[PDB]
Amino acid sequence: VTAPGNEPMAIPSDYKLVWADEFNTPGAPDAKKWRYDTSRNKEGWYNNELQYYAAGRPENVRVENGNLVIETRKERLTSMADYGGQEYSSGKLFTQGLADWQYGYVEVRAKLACGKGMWPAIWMMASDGSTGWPALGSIDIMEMVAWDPTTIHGTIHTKAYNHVIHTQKGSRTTAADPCGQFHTYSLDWTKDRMLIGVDGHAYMRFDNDHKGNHDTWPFDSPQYLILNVAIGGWGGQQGVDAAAFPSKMEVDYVRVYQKR
Numbered sequence: 001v002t003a004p005g006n007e008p009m010a011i012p013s014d015y016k017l018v019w020a021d022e023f024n025t026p027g028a029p030d031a032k033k034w035r036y037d038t039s040r041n042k043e044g045w046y047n048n049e050l051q052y053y054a055a056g057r058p059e060n061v062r063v064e065n066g067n068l069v070i071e072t073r074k075e076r077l078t079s080m081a082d083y084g085g086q087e088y089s090s091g092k093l094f095t096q097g098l099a100d101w102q103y104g105y106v107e108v109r110a111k112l113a114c115g116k117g118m119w120p121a122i123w124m125m126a127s128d129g130s131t132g133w134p135a136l137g138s139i140d141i142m143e144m145v146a147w148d149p150t151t152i153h154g155t156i157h158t159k160a161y162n163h164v165i166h167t168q169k170g171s172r173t174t175a176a177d178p179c180g181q182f183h184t185y186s187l188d189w190t191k192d193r194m195l196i197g198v199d200g201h202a203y204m205r206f207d208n209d210h211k212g213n214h215d216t217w218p219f220d221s222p223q224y225l226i227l228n229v230a231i232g233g234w235g236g237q238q239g240v241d242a243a244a245f246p247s248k249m250e251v252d253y254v255r256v257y258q259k260r
């Protein structure tokens with residue numbers, strides 16, 4: 001654990017809600033809130049991932065009974081022009097080009113996708129990607145890899161601190177039955193520090209060293225939100241269990257708060 005935290009977190013009293021998706025409207029995700037990422041479907045995704053992210057496909061991404069559903073399936077979507085030979089479909093949504101935030105408290109209430117292979121994620125990347133990944137700054141509010149389905153991972157990545165060179169700043173905790181019950185996954189991002197937590201408890205803290213070095217604090221510019229369920233890579237360490245499909249992440253809401 002390279003970014004340990006141990007402190008409470010809660011929506012600050014002096015913040016207001018500035019953005020939410022409550023997933024109130026069944027059917028397609030609200031196109032004024034979310035866009036689909038298809039950028040690497042034909043080529044194969046990063047992290048040796050095994051999914052095809054289907055855009056506009058209710059089988060993988062839909063709003064039902066007040067929840068977003070991102071569902072993994074074992075199927076070859078060979079009719080898709082951007083199909084890349086994948087054995088699985090899934091979803092990836094982001095607020096890129098629609099909404100982003102510099103600082104804030106982000107709360108996502110979600111039930112995660114289980115089964116060996118599954119890699120549900122709730123994360124952020126900087127809107128200004130001119131420095132490339134990883135320099136632009138990424139915030140993993142929640143990852144879980146379903147070979148270890150009770151373990152919630154909270155991580156940030158920067159030019160200096162990232163998984164490629166094993167310097168990522170992260171921590172972890174566990175939660176009761178994360179695929180069977182909702183928990184709140186939360187980020188408290190200020191100019192001084194990030195806390196990442198579950199159910200009101202920060203288990204991860206990453207401070208701004210205030211050295212003005214973009215390499216170690218790229219987080220004084222806006223980030224957009226990403227929701228996806230990857231398959232394989234880190235999620236596939238103990239293989240991809242065909243019996244687990246279909247598997248779904250349900251997201252009751254995303255709420256963003258900022259200094260009133």
Ligand SMILES: OC[C@H]1O[C@@H](O[C@H]2[C@H](O)[C@@H](O)[C@H](O[C@@H]3[C@@H](O)[C@@H](O)O[C@H](CO)[C@H]3O)O[C@@H]2CO)[C@H](O)[C@@H](O)[C@@H]1O
Pocket residue numbers: 046047119120121123132133138139140143157163230
């Ligand atoms: O390998 C260089 C290419 O990286 C691309 O960026 C990827 C990166 O490869 C990938 O490891 C990273 O994966 C994410 C994790 O770092 C973490 O943030 O959690 C995410 C959700 O689980 C996980 O996807 O994603 C990067 C962004 O897709 C660059 O896009 C590319 O230009 C570069 O050549």
Ligand SMILES: OC[C@H]1O[C@@H](O[C@H]2[C@H](O)[C@@H](O)[C@H](O)O[C@@H]2CO)[C@H](O)[C@@H](O)[C@@H]1O
Pocket residue numbers: 047140143153154155156163166168170171234
């Ligand atoms: O593989 C990408 C994945 O890397 C994760 O980093 C560490 C992780 O913190 C640690 O718990 C595990 O044992 O090693 C991995 C790979 O070095 C990182 O936490 C994620 O954000 C990232 O998606």
Ligand SMILES: [Ca+2]
Pocket residue numbers: 022023024065066067251252253
């Ligand atoms: Ca809801």
